[PDB]
Symmetry: C3
């Protein structure tokens, strides 16, 4: 039983942009917000959307969705020195993540692997 689950999510950026007009306090952890403070405009919108999509994708990979087991603030998406997104949450599994965002959409995928 190597793959524990997979999850994908697609988000319309304008939906996030609208929700941004305290939404970020609900989606992004303290560390993520400190990164977001240095972003603006479309970049901030796509960053928030990317994180949302990553966390949701991850919650689908576990099979529960955002809820009592896993919510937004239990997860932190960090970018490594190369810019590669790393998902940090308490779990026995290996989390593989990827994100992409065009001008109007963001997508994220997660593959959970047994350790």
């Amino acid at each position: 039983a190597m793959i524990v689950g997979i999850g994908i999510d697609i988000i319309e950026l304008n939906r996030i942009e609208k929700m941004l007009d305290k939404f970020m306090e609900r989606i992004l952890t303290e560390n993520e917000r400190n990164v977001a403070k240095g972003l603006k405009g479309s970049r901030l919108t796509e960053f928030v959307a990317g994180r949302f999509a990553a966390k949701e994708a991850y919650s689908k990979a576990v099979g529960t969705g955002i809820g009592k087991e896993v919510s937004f603030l239990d997860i932190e998406v960090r970018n490594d020195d190369r810019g590669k997104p790393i998902l940090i949450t308490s779990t026995e599994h290996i989390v593989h993540l990827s994100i992409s965002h065009s001008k109007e959409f963001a997508v994220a995928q997660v593959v959970l692997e047994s350790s």
Copy 2:
């Protein structure tokens, strides 16, 4: 001997499915799925049919054949478990991993087929 036999992804414009809906469903949805579709309306029915189409198509790409003589729409059933997680049921010796998502205008599905040996 790869543990992953194949992967598949599909993106579908919801307005295209909505037009096709305006019988299309009898071709894409099995009987259990249509019974589930019966209780849906408007955007929900459209996104539901779209997600099924995409899950099935994505699965067929994971097998590497696409929808055709080996695999077609009616050989596959996508049911949601009690938590809402989509489960793909078809005759195969492999483990099927699936995920679906649908915004207001797009639906996306992905499949990863894993070897059970």
Copy 3:
């Protein structure tokens, strides 16, 4: 340590189309351009777009993105006899790939698996 990495990419087709109207020579290898040479209109655009995205998604799977270790011309995406996309590049890993394209968007994903 089964999966070495995964990569996803979404591209707006009209963006690639604008870049087309030089560019293909930067994104497509010789073999790939000989295929593209027989395509036109939206089919050529989606084709190039799916290649861009496949190659970009592969580079994310590697964890470096397009750059000094992996660039577009180091990678060739072929279609087998059934139409399935096969990613050909220098690596010790098994490359799993998929592409999809609607009227307005192309998406590609990659899962890299370790051989051992």
